[PDB]
Design a protein around this ligand. Structure first.
Ligand code: HEM
Ligand code: HEM
Ligand SMILES: Nc1ccc(Br)cc1-c1nnc[nH]1
Ligand SMILES: Nc1ccc(Br)cc1-c1nnc[nH]1
Ligand SMILES: Nc1ccc(Br)cc1-c1nnc[nH]1
Ligand SMILES: Nc1ccc(Br)cc1-c1nnc[nH]1
Lengths: 373, 370
């Protein structure tokens, strides 16, 4: 494919992301690398206010400024949300908010933590020679001890990598339709569903690394944004960069392109319409790296594969297409099981629009099947 | 630019749009050509209700499926707004509701009259071998007598054709960036800024052929949509297509590709920053013909012209890039002077509106280099 920066083996996730910033930023990196201890002792908001306003101009390449965008993004959630039970600050200091919005504007991303930061750029191979397994991988930053941020971010990364192996098949699919090669288009679709089926099995690992109350009561808070949230009703002022407070949404997996790019490929129109589900997933495209949100829109530029499969009265071709589609339903169905475990049940041991959103994304996917009515 | 359906002479507008449908669709074109008298006669809404459910199967080519969408688009606005004084139908008759909505589904458009309908496809040459200027041109459809829809639809279209002259230069700009031909890139930038300066001058003709009396009270009413509008709080029931009422946004020039396409070429990211202006302009892209939101998406897929000019420290390149940005700034600021004459003082005889345009104009200003 063209340079949408889709690595061959890890896909959309940043390949071998950078761990250490230049020594010029050693005072950023200390607060980020010690987020749990600084928060629970009560010194974080202090220690960020005692920083100097460092300059982006020492952030050379892409990998360095993503890492800096991750460091600054995690520090921001640490500042805004505090210890995570209510004492909130709605003003981000200038020494932190200026370099953030400058770096973020250079990367065409909003100034808030996003899936591309805490997942796609927040990982590390422990042994550079063993494969991308959970036990060979680690996270770069956490918010609190026992927040399961290692499990949550790494499992998502492993799921994204699993679905990424289907991305290299997409070029075959489009050429097979163009040159009208039915047998290759069949197995091409068959293998895309194969990778999406492998993605579902890696997703099962989340039970082994994420605890329901930790996620709910801890990790959920530090991933919250300030769009539509009462606690910051008008958003967050970025002192020294913007005059009025701005409103940006929290990090979500709807910000990932692989999870969006298969509805687009299979003609499943999650973004079509004016409904809340459609507009939300359209909104989250703006929280993706620019190269990624361009990859989605250039898939929409191609001819519909859903129609090509409809147009041909081919049973083996419609079942192959349906295999892709079902895999998405199976992923989204098992996913509802998991938001029930990790959000719904803990929410009652101390809401519905969340469910209806997911069941609508799910419904749209099931309705896209051609067979099994 | 292979088949984003850009015309060499006309640009994103439909080149020489078709005037008459098949005679199978004479029942449609009758209401469409006779909207002014049928609306004032109060007989419009019935003649829509007492028409058969025609099939879209006999609209063969793009040019026929377009003006069919133009015909059904105007009939729908008239049926929903009526005489234009507040009394609103909230249900679309199913014998018009679904020929419209499957023709819209075929062209990937939303079922409502939009900029590509009433401007890009709604024109004609008076004398075929005379130039594309206002006197030699006319619009194919109007709403009410004296609504100045001819002026408002033509001066917009003529502005769109002036900017089309710069579309020819876009491949030269990117080919220059890759081959690294800094001399050819500069004149390419200057030729672009040149046409955006002739687009502002063509825009001056607006004060001639449209009238603040008629635009605010008549034309703006018939071009209004049912999205975030209290008159159709929940939208329009497209009877026989969706049980629920769907809500679509009205017509806007933000639905035009040329004016979004220069922002993206120059790295002016209106659509970025999470602002209200960012989302309106992006949501307007789904009200565009599919090749035009395709062409726009693939411009963003190229390396930004803005950063190449910043890399070089080339005062000449920097001045050329500014020349286009300033052409955009003055287009938007002179455009702010027109909403003042045509929307605000008329409404004095609303302000979230100009907040959008000033934010949009200021981000155009903040993009200047020195
Ligand atoms: C504790 C585990 C999880 C919980 C509680 C959870 C919860 C949620 C919630 C609340 C939403 C609604 C969208 C939003 O609020 O932004 C959502 C959607 C979504 N989730 Fe998760 N999630 C979890 C794990 C995962 C993982 C590991 C993935 C990796 C693929 C994932 C993929 C998605 C996607 C793609 C969406 C967007 C809707 C769609 O495209 O189907 N989720 N989830
Ligand atoms: C009486 C004349 C006009 C009035 C009152 C008017 C009004 C407006 C309004 C209210 C908006 C805000 C967006 C919206 O509410 O839809 C807007 C934006 C816009 N106008 Fe017009 N307009 C006029 C003529 C024109 C013409 C002839 C053009 C030529 C194409 C044009 C180009 C644009 C564009 C492209 C936008 C989108 C915002 C931008 O990109 O700058 N306007 N105008
Ligand atoms: N899997 C994830 C990884 C990182 C971030 Br931020 C959010 C999610 C998510 N999962 N469901 C909804 N969002
Ligand atoms: N909800 C989704 C939508 C598209 C894709 Br691809 C994956 C998921 C998913 N959810 N949990 C794990 N994976
Ligand atoms: N110039 C236009 C022509 C047709 C339609 Br519909 C809308 C406009 C417009 N201008 N400013 C905002 N919208
Ligand atoms: N508002 C605009 C935005 C972009 C471009 Br290009 C032209 C205009 C304009 N149209 N009439 C007056 N100005």
């Amino acid at each position: 494919s063209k340079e949408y920066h889709i690595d061959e083996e890890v896909g959309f996730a940043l390949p071998n992301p950078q761990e250490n910033l230049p020594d010029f930023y050693n005072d950023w990196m200390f607060i980020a690398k010690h987020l749990p201890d600084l928060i629970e002792s009560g010194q974080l908001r202090e220690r960020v206010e005692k920083l100097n306003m460092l300059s982006i101009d020492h952030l050379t390449d892409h990998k360095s400024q993503r890492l800096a965008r991750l460091v600054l993004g995690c520090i921001t959630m640490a500042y805004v949300w505090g210890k995570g039970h209510g004492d909130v600050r709605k003003v981000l200091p200038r020494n932190i908010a200026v370099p953030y919005c400058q770096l973020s504007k250079k990367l065409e991303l909003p100034p808030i933590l996003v899936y591309a930061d805490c997942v796609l750029a927040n990982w590390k191979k422990k042994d550079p020679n063993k494969p991308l397994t959970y036990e060979n991988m680690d996270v770069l930053f956490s918010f609190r001890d026992g927040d399961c941020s290692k499990g949550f971010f790494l499992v998502s990364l492993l799921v994204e990598i699993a679905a990424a192996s289907a991305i290299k098949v997409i070029p075959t699919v489009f050429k097979a339709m163009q040159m009208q090669e039915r047998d290759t288009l069949l197995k091409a679709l068959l293998e895309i569903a194969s990778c999406l089926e492998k993605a579902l099995q890696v997703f099962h690992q989340i039970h082994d690394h994420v605890n329901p109350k930790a996620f709910f009561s801890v990790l959920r808070i530090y991933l919250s944004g300030w769009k539509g949230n009462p606690q910051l009703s008008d958003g967050l002022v970025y002192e020294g960069f913007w005059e009025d407070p701005k409103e940006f949404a929290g990090g979500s997996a709807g910000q990932s392109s692989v999870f969006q790019c298969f509805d687009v490929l299979l003609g499943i129109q999650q973004t079509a319409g004016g409904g809340h589900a459609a507009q939300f997933l359209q909104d989250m495209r703006r929280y993706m790296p620019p190269a990624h949100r361009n990859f989605l829109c250039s898939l929409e530029s191609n001819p519909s594969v859903r129609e090509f499969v409809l147009s041909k009265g081919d049973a083996g071709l419609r079942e192959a297409y349906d295999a892709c589609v079902k895999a998405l339903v199976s992923l989204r169905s098992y996913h509802l099981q998991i938001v029930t475990k990790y959000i719904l049940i803990p929410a009652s041991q101390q809401g519905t629009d969340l469910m209806n959103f997911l069941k609508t994304v799910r419904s749209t996917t099931e309705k896209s099947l051609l067979k099994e009515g």
